[model samples]
Target chain A: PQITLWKRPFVTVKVGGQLKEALLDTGADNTIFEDINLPGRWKPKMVGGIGGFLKVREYDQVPIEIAGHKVIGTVLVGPTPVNVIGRDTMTQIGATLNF
Target chain B: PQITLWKRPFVTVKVGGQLKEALLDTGADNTIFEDINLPGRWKPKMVGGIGGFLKVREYDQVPIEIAGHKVIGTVLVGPTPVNVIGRDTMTQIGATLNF
Candidate 1:
């Protein structure tokens, strides 16, 4: 299904059997989840957004099902206000912007 | 043109005879420019991003050429770090998420 920008592009995502809603963020370079538990080792990193910077933990090869498409890519754990599916995951799912 | 998520989607915009680079930000609800001058009666508004919020002046029906496509929409002027073309303008340009 094509997603129009008429409203917030919130899509259903499944991670670790947990159903969640996330935004498909074209401006975001990295995929990030807020306060989610996942069994893995992460490297501390910093990321920047529209407002400012944030400290995040980067996890490797995290698999998530976004809008019924299974995507395995770099996922970040952070304190962001919303769960965002960024280009890292968007690319994995072969997402594109068409006008 | 199809914009793949392989890289950060930055596009050239022409506003007020000035050429500027801006990010195509699906996560942002309103388009915002940092430190640009536009003459009009603007309303004070606050917008929230990943990190936090910022105060902006909302301008109405600002004409802009984004990636060679002309668009007129609600544009905000603020102290944001980067210029962002948000969903408001994206809808005007008929941008959609396709896989």
Candidate 2:
């Protein structure tokens, strides 16, 4: 199924049994959540974006559902303004940027 | 025409009479160049991203060519790490996210 890219390209997502809306962000390399409560170990890391860098907790082997597609991989939890589904999980779900 | 979503979706862009490669950043609200030489007056503004915020020079009605598509609108000039084609100009070029 195809989804229309709205002004913000937002879609429903499920992570750790919780449903949330995330932005389909092609510019980002990893999926980022506002805050996560996944059961696993995480490492402290920093990620750079359009501006400066941010400290984040990187959790491995996290399962997420986006647009009914299941994607299992690394997820980053941090003080992000919004939830973003980036290229890492997006590729596994066969997501692409189109004209 | 449709372009494939690579690990990093990059496209050739022409701005300020010079050609450069830019990332198609759906997460960004406005188009931004690493540095621009467009002939126009601009205002100072701050934009936030995944991390922090940065000051930018916003130029009005700037013309940019992306992936052979001509997009005319506001363009931000700043000390960005990379050139980005954001939603503002992308919408004008009929760009969208697909899966």
Question: Any runs in candidate 1 off by more than 4 Å, and if so which?
Answer: A49-52, B39-55
Two-chain DockQ for each candidate model: 0.64, 0.49
Residue-level lDDT tens digits of model 2 in A1-99: 554444688888888778888988888888889766688778988766555666778888777887778877888888777998888888888876777
How close to the true structure is residue A38 of candidate 2, measured as C-alpha lDDT? Answer: 80
Residue pairs whose backbone atoms clash in candidate 2: none
Error of 1 at B47 (Å): 6.1
Candidate 1 overall Cα lDDT vs. reference?
A: 0.83
Worst 10 residues of 1 chain B by lDDT: B46-55
True-vs-predicted CA distance for residue A40, candidate 2, Å: 3.5
Give the Cα error of residue A87 in candidate 1, in Å: 0.3
Instruction: List, in the given order, the native-contact fraction of each candidate.
Output: 0.93, 0.64
Candidate 2: where is the Cα deviation over 4 Å? A1-6, A41-55, B50-52
What is the number of residue pairs that collide in model 2? 0
Clashes of each: 0, 0
Among these predictions, the greatest lDDT belongs to 1
